[PDB]
Design a protein around this ligand. Structure first.
Ligand code: NA
Ligand code: NA
Lengths: 244, 244
């Protein structure tokens, strides 16, 4: 049943990941959290830590101006404020408040522009360790919005016949070989104006074309690792509920 | 600053969810898990339970036939077998092994056909409580494949000039008001033949058109709830690593 061939090693062929992906949708949390929590972890003993950082940066969400609409977005300035109050004491490594704009380009181009900004915040090493989740997360900021439209991290502002305003709040927690003894926390507040009506925006794909004016606010926060292996699960449950 | 208007109550306007969403990507788990774990929970004390069910149904994954390609898929038959060995003892409520086919239709139609099958497995009540995650999950089975292409739950089979074969493995754990004293576990193994080359499949959207022959294998498993609030986090870490 079929002679065994000598190995032809293709060094560019990407091997299948061994990473385990678990998504939690927690109905009716005690306290509301309006940040999509995306966690890239190699040691589950740092999950609680990751969740607590998301709990902290919920307080850095601010309302948009009335002209934009009735929405919440992560504020870099308020983020810095909040950062200094977090225990255990960490360090703000970087922060950005930058506008991004394109005219009559594919949504895929916009995604790339935003990725560029976030990769600058993360850095090469950090970027590389989370590239799949980061790419997905940014993709899901501009597309796949129908299933997300009523979720806690996205807010619809003013909706004209030519334009849709909406905010999108995502937080990345990273702990792996590229981070060492700290966990990086990167909250992102998107303020997005797009040149389509909401009904079209809801079904936008990477192929669609549109003009965007987008403000990106983010910081990168390094907190020394604290394992939670010895605490009861009740404490994790509490962290998730935001009551810890 | 602007007279307060009497309330105009629109009873169809869907309110924003309060649900908290947390995604974990666990790099280098001790034991490999090839099921995308999607958890709809109202009490985080049942997370460990949810993860342990995913650990169990990893053993119900079987290789496809050589004609299809080198892929793993959840097997309903092997699932039933595995079900009977799970402790604490639960009950197989339903199971399906059904082919789904369409000709020259939009991908959105295929998604709807698959949703129909999975909703039949779940039932009205259960379906309704997880509709967003279920819709997203099925959408992500047929689209958004580029960021997923190297992940642990998707396997690429034979790839011709006219057809692409791939498997997709997703597990839903549900615990809320619609489940009561049990948690429902619904693993799904997709075996998908699509009439496009891989390069196109990778960037398929809901708008694209294609022909599909798809086999869906799933069961619905009810396990009585066991809270884990009093165990150490180490046990959750262990469950995630599949060493518990
Ligand atoms: Na939906
Ligand atoms: Na990618």
């Amino acid at each position: 049943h079929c002679p065994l061939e000598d190995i032809k090693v293709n060094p560019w062929k990407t091997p299948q990941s061994t990473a385990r992906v678990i998504t939690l949708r927690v109905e009716d949390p005690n306290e509301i959290n309006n940040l999509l929590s995306i966690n890239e972890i190699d040691n589950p003993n740092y999950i609680l830590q990751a969740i607590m950082l998301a709990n902290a940066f919920q307080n850095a969400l601010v309302p948009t101006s009335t002209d934009f609409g009735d929405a919440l977005r992560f504020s870099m300035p308020k983020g810095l404020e909040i950062a200094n109050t977090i225990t255990p004491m960490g360090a703000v490594v970087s922060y950005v408040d930058q506008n991004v704009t394109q005219t009559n380009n594919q949504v895929s181009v916009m995604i790339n522009k935003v990725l560029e900004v976030l990769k600058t915040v993360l850095g090469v090493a950090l970027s590389g360790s989370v590239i799949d989740q980061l790419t997905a997360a940014v993709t899901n900021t501009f597309t796949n919005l129908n299933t997300q439209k009523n979720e806690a991290w996205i807010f619809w502002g003013k909706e004209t016949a030519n334009q849709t305003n909406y905010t999108y709040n995502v937080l990345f927690a990273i702990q792996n070989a590229q981070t060492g003894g700290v966990m990086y926390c990167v909250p992102v507040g998107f303020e997005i104006k797009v040149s389509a009506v909401k009904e079209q925006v809801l079904f936008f794909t990477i192929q669609d074309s549109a003009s965007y004016n987008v403000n990106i606010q983010s910081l990168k926060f390094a907190q020394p690792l604290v394992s939670s292996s010895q605490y009861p699960i009740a404490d994790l449950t509490s962290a998730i509920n935001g009551t810890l």
